Amino acid sequence: MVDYSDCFEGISGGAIFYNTKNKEYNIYNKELIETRRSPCSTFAIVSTLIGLEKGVINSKESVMGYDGTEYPNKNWNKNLSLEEAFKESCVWYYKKLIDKVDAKSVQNILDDLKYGNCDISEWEGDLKNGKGHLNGFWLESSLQISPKEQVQTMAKIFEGDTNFKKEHINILRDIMKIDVNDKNINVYGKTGTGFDEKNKRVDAWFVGMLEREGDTYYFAIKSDDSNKEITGPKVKEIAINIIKKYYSV
Ligand SMILES: [Cl-]
């Protein structure tokens, strides 16, 4: 077990890195890394592949059709492409996408990916939050997955061990790339932000992979802090600092 607590600056959380080469896990906070939680918008990694496999989308430019709804997040207020929906965590785009897939197809794909509890029973999500259609089974609802299960899922997808087409995985890699001000390393990832009302803790995520020289690491960074200021973007900042201090040369 490793200690990346310095990069969390007192925020409650954990981190797990996996190298498919030597099959070794680098684990900070084992109990937290093994606890299942809602994936929130990190589910966009898998929903993007489901949409491509089923022909609901076909490229980084694919649009889903904007109905003119004025959302609080003004970055959602247009007919945005797959790459923009991924980067802006656009829930309306991904709900309209998954609504065009039979639950049985989603169930079979999650079961084959071993995506945590694979529970999509609350399809429409938790309507008790008053958000209406801005909800889904992957947003503080029935679907739950641990940080370790996220990295096991990432490894199977990007090492070619799933049924997804390599062409579709390459589209996902492209939209997952993030700029970290260091051409020597390639970082890919998706943020997730939610609040677990029952337990009064955030679900703040940054899930992805690091490609450095001759090594690839699949990673999941997670916070369960009490402070609602702790969001996916903040956990992404922590992830980049962990990568800079413990995964550089
Ligand atoms: Cl360490």
Residue numbers in the entry: 40 to 288
Publication text:
Clostridioides difficile causes life-threatening gastrointestinal infections. Herein, we report 30 X-ray structures from a structure genomics pipeline spanning 13 years, representing 10.2% of the X-ray structures for this important pathogen.
The structures presented here are part of the C. difficile 630, R20291, and Y384 sets nominated at CSBID. The overall success of structure determination for C. difficile in both CSBID pipelines was 7%, with a total of 23 unique structures and eight variants or ligand-bound proteins determined.
